[PDB]
């Protein structure tokens, strides 16, 4: 549950160094960029997700 904490809240940086403060709406916008999806899909469809 400590690793379930920092994955949802603190981002991807908790194991690579000191923990940042990343909001959850800004996590999945940059997790779509690895698979080739921009930020147009997340912010409009956020009620459907």
């Amino acid at each position: 549950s400590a690793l379930l904490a920092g994955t949802i809240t603190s981002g991807w940086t908790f194991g690579a160094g000191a923990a940042l403060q990343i909001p959850f709406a800004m996590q999945m916008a940059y997790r779509f960029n690895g698979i080739g999806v921009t930020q147009n899909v997340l912010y409009e469809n956020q009620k459907l997700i």
Partner: protein
């Protein structure tokens, strides 16, 4: 199996992977580990 599990705790949970059929089927979003007796249960959030 534990070295496969310690890789997927490092790659899938603590980071983002572009892989297919490693962090789960489809495009990888994030992974949620859960506690299990004599093992570990992964929850793979995928993009289909």
């Amino acid at each position: 199996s534990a070295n496969l599990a310690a890789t997927k705790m490092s790659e899938c949970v603590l980071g983002q992977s572009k892989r297919v059929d490693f962090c789960g089927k489809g495009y990888h979003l994030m992974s949620f580990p859960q506690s299990a007796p004599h093992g570990v249960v992964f929850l793979h959030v995928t993009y289909v």
